[PDB]
Design an enzyme around this catalytic site. Structure first.
Site, PDB file in Angstrom:
ATOM      1  N   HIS A  62      -3.548  19.191 -86.287  1.00  0.00           N
ATOM      2  CA  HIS A  62      -3.502  20.645 -86.177  1.00  0.00           C
ATOM      3  C   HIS A  62      -2.525  21.243 -87.192  1.00  0.00           C
ATOM      4  O   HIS A  62      -2.827  22.251 -87.863  1.00  0.00           O
ATOM      5  CB  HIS A  62      -3.108  21.046 -84.756  1.00  0.00           C
ATOM      6  CG  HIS A  62      -3.124  22.534 -84.524  1.00  0.00           C
ATOM      7  ND1 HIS A  62      -1.986  23.250 -84.215  1.00  0.00           N
ATOM      8  CD2 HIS A  62      -4.137  23.432 -84.559  1.00  0.00           C
ATOM      9  CE1 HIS A  62      -2.301  24.529 -84.070  1.00  0.00           C
ATOM     10  NE2 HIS A  62      -3.602  24.666 -84.273  1.00  0.00           N
ATOM     11  N   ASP A  84      -7.307  25.938 -84.098  1.00  0.00           N
ATOM     12  CA  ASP A  84      -6.816  26.019 -82.729  1.00  0.00           C
ATOM     13  C   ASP A  84      -7.806  25.410 -81.743  1.00  0.00           C
ATOM     14  O   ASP A  84      -7.413  24.648 -80.861  1.00  0.00           O
ATOM     15  CB  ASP A  84      -6.488  27.471 -82.361  1.00  0.00           C
ATOM     16  CG  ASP A  84      -5.326  28.039 -83.190  1.00  0.00           C
ATOM     17  OD1 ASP A  84      -5.145  29.286 -83.185  1.00  0.00           O
ATOM     18  OD2 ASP A  84      -4.588  27.251 -83.854  1.00  0.00           O
TER      19      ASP A  84
HETATM   20  C1  LIG Z   1       2.745  34.166 -76.705  1.00  0.00           C
HETATM   21  C2  LIG Z   1       1.993  32.844 -76.814  1.00  0.00           C
HETATM   22  C3  LIG Z   1       2.908  31.651 -76.612  1.00  0.00           C
HETATM   23  C4  LIG Z   1       2.177  30.308 -76.696  1.00  0.00           C
HETATM   24  C5  LIG Z   1       3.138  29.183 -77.001  1.00  0.00           C
HETATM   25  C6  LIG Z   1       2.494  27.800 -76.930  1.00  0.00           C
HETATM   26  C7  LIG Z   1       1.441  27.606 -78.008  1.00  0.00           C
HETATM   27  C8  LIG Z   1       0.960  26.161 -78.110  1.00  0.00           C
HETATM   28  C9  LIG Z   1       2.073  25.122 -78.134  1.00  0.00           C
HETATM   29  C10 LIG Z   1       1.546  23.758 -78.520  1.00  0.00           C
HETATM   30  C11 LIG Z   1       0.855  23.703 -79.873  1.00  0.00           C
HETATM   31  C12 LIG Z   1       0.156  22.375 -80.088  1.00  0.00           C
HETATM   32  C13 LIG Z   1      -0.444  22.205 -81.473  1.00  0.00           C
HETATM   33  C14 LIG Z   1       0.567  22.070 -82.592  1.00  0.00           C
HETATM   34  O1  LIG Z   1       1.760  21.760 -82.306  1.00  0.00           O
HETATM   35  O2  LIG Z   1       0.192  22.304 -83.782  1.00  0.00           O
END
Ligand SMILES: CCCCCCCCCCCCCC(=O)O
Ligand SMILES: CCCCCCCCCCCCCC(=O)O
Lengths: 122, 122
Positions: free
Chosen positions: B47, B89
């Site tokens: 990702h 995503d």
């Molecule tokens: C206001 C929205 C807040 C959302 C915060 C969490 C978003 C996803 C966290 C984990 C991301 C996984 C993929 C990655 O690390 O590239």
């Protein structure tokens, strides 16, 4: 950097810092500022404003030196921007600790951050 | 943006996204890439590399449209960058779901992210 910041918040609050503050309220953690929900949120609001005075360094990625002396965060011998950065971080860790009394778990995971009312200027 | 990303992760995995993945392994959430700790971590590595090659929009900040159609994430046409980002995503949310079977709580709060082995180039 985020490492030092997280370490400070853990040291002051005793709490897992991403857990308690990573998405808290309108100002703590990810994203920008917004109308604060409570005192804890204001700590974070003040912290993000503090960052804006910084020039010469990157608050997210730049590591800096600090120590723990008599249970106090002591900002190290760094340079001008890193020193003020470290002082911004220390101040928010202290503020978060001081407002543990009103920390509200229901604000812990505010995935509605983008819809917080626009923050006033710093 | 982080809003869409966290929402997709919730819809795919059923888990609080910041909670499960905000500080997981050497690749998930805050910070950069590093040697993956497991399959979940690897999802986030991919990702982050997906994010690397986007141009035209900001992956963490820029909102985009998608819909939930027959429990499938369907990226809106948006524009070139926003669609690619949406598919970045979507891919990680699916990947994280597919790897819940080996998700390990011991990796959930890796405050030692900066000390992960350096990641290979994307
Ligand atoms: C206001 C929205 C807040 C959302 C915060 C969490 C978003 C996803 C966290 C984990 C991301 C996984 C993929 C990655 O690390 O590239
Ligand atoms: C391994 C990297 C360390 C990750 C720790 C992240 C914890 C920081 C979240 C607390 C938010 C601080 C207040 C603010 O938003 O200004």
């Amino acid at each position: 950097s985020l490492f030092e910041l997280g370490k400070m918040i853990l040291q002051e609050t005793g709490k897992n810092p991403a857990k308690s503050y990573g998405v808290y309220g309108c100002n703590c953690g990810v994203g920008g500022r917004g109308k604060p929900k409570d005192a804890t949120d204001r700590c974070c609001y003040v912290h993000k404003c503090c960052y804006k005075k910084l020039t010469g360094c990157d608050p997210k990625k730049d590591r800096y030196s600090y120590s723990w002396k008599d249970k106090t965060i002591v900002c190290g011998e760094n340079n001008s921007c890193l020193k003020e950065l470290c002082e911004c971080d220390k101040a928010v860790a202290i503020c978060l600790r001081e407002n543990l009394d009103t920390y509200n778990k229901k604000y812990r995971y505010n995935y509605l951050k983008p819809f917080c009312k626009k923050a006033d200027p710093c």
